[PDB]
C-alpha cells in the first residue's frame, strides 16, 4: 500500500479584518479535505462525501462541542503569545498535528505550532519534549513539559489514536484514496532563443499527485539544469506537472509503481 497521512490544522487570527474568521480548523487525509470548522458557522462539517456518509450526526455534534472549546483555547493562547512578544494588532497562531502510515507499515507522527506563519514549537514524541525557537517559545515549553502525563497522552494520540483514525478514514474513502489514474505524458521540443532548444516533459491526468519525473542523457543522469513545474490540481481530482531542459535525451517518469520512458 502507498503512504497515507492524517493532518489537522488550526488557524487563529487576532483582531481579524472584516471577513476572515477568528478561528478555522480543517482536517486532511493525504491531499483531500475531510472536515471543517470555523468560528462563523461554529459547526463541525464533513468536507468529503465519504466522511458524511460514514459518520452519523452525533459524531458531528460531539466534535462541534470540542472545536468550540479548542477555539476558545486557541484564542487565549494567542493573547498570551502576543503579550510575551509585546505585539499589538493582528497576529496569527497555527497548529498542525498528524501522522503517516508508511508503505512498509512503519509510522510517523508530528505536532507543531507556528506564530505569524513561522515555526514556534515542535514536539518530540521520542524524548517527550518541546523544541523552542526563541525565549518566548521556551517559556511555553517549560510550562508544557512540566505536565508529564500530558506529554504521554500526546505520544499515545500520535502513535495510536491518529493512526487508527487514519486507517478508519482510508477505508471510508478507499475508492477515492487508493485508486490509480496513470499519467498522460508527452515531450515537446522547440527552438527558443536562436540556437537554444527547449525540451518539456509534461504530465497530466494522474492520481495520486506523487509523481517522479526527470531527464536523462544517454541513459545516465543529467548534470545540467532541470527546471521543475509544480504538481498542480487540474480541478477534476487529478494532477499535472512537468520538467524541462536545454540541448540523446529521454524523459523518465515514475508513477504508482509504473516506470515510463520517452525518448527524444
Amino acid at each position, epitope marked *: 500500500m502507498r503512504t497515507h497521512s492524517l493532518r489537522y490544522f488550526r488557524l487563529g487570527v487576532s483582531d481579524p479584518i472584516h471577513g476572515v474568521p477568528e478561528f478555522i480548523s480543517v482536517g486532511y487525509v493525504d491531499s483531500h479535505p475531510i472536515t471543517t470548522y470555523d468560528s462563523v458557522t461554529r459547526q463541525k462539517e464533513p468536507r468529503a462525501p465519504w466522511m458524511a456518509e460514514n459518520l452519523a450526526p452525533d*459524531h458531528w*455534534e*460531539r*466534535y462541534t*462541542q*470540542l472545536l*468550540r*472549546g*479548542w477555539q*476558545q*483555547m486557541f484564542k487565549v493562547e494567542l493573547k498570551r503569545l502576543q503579550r510575551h512578544y509585546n505585539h499589538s494588532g493582528s497576529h496569527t497562531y497555527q497548529r498542525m498535528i498528524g501522522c503517516e502510515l508508511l508503505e512498509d507499515g512503519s509510522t510517523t507522527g508530528f505536532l507543531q505550532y507556528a506564530y505569524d506563519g513561522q515555526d514556534f514549537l515542535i514536539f518530540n514524541k521520542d524524548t517527550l519534549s518541546w523544541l523552542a525557537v526563541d525565549n518566548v517559545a521556551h517559556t511555553i515549553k517549560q510550562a508544557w513539559e512540566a*505536565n508529564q*502525563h*500530558e506529554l*504521554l*497522552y*500526546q*505520544k*499515545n*494520540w500520535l502513535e*495510536e*489514536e491518529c493512526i*487508527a*483514525w487514519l486507517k478508519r478514514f482510508l477505508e471510508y474513502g478507499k475508492d477515492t484514496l487508493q485508486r490509480t489514474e496513470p499519467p498522460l505524458v508527452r515531450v515537446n521540443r522547440k527552438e527558443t532563443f536562436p540556437g537554444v532548444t527547449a525540451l518539456f516533459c509534461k504530465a497530466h491526468g494522474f492520481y495520486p499527485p506523487e509523481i517522479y519525473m526527470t531527464w536523462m542523457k544517454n541513459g545516465e543522469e543529467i548534470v545540467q539544469e532541470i527546471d521543475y513545474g509544480d504538481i498542480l490540481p487540474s480541478g477534476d481530482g487529478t494532477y499535472q506537472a512537468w520538467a524541462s531542459i536545454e540541448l540523446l535525451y529521454s524523459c523518465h517518469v515514475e508513477h504508482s509503481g509504473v516506470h515510463m520512458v520517452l525518448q527524444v
Partner: antibody
Amino acid sequence: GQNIDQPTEMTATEGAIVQINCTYQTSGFNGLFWYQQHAGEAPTFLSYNVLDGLEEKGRFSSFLSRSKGYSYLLLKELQMKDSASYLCAVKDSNYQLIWGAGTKLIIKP
Amino acid sequence: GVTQTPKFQVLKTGQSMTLQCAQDMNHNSMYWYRQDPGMGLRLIYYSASEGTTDKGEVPNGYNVSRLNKREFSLRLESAAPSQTSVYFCASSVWTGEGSGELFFGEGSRLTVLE
C-alpha cells in the same frame, strides 16, 4: 466506547495488599483514570495511565496494559481508612469518560 | 475548588428545582453527573467551554445553563421520583485533553416524593 468492568466489591485484611482490576472495551483510548470515593463523599482523582507501565504514588500504584485492555489499582499496607469505593474511568476516541460502576473495598481489621 | 448547592433537598413531584455549581479554578469545562447505586456515573449535560453546552447520556427531565465561565446550573423542569439521586457537579481545565482530571463538588442529595 461501550464497556468498563471492575468488581462490585473486594475484601482484604488490614496490613496486607489488594489489587483492583479494571478491564475496558472502548472505541479508542485516551487514558484510564482511578478515583477514590469515600462513603457519602465526592470522588477524588487518584491516578492516570495512558501508556504501558506502572506508576507509584505512595501506597498506591496504577498499572496499564493497552494490549490487554487492562488496568489495576494496587494498594499496599492496607489501612482501615482505605475503605472506600474505587472508580475506574476510560476516555474514548471522542474524549468522553466511560465510568465503571465502582469497586467497594472492605478492610478487615 | 468546586462549590455546589444544596447538599440536601426534598421535592414534591412536579416541583421545579435549580442546582447551582460554581468553580473558581478558571476551568473551561463543567459537568453534571448523577450517581445511582449499581452503575457508573452518568453524564446529564456538560459544557465544553464558556458559551456552549450539550446533552450528556441522560438529558431528559433536565436542562442546564452555562451562566459564565464560573457557573453551570442544573434545572429539574418538572421533578419526577426517578430523579431521586445524588448529583455531582465537576469541572476540568479543558475537554479533549487526555490527562486532565475531573474535580468534583460535594454532591447534592435529592429526594422526589409524591
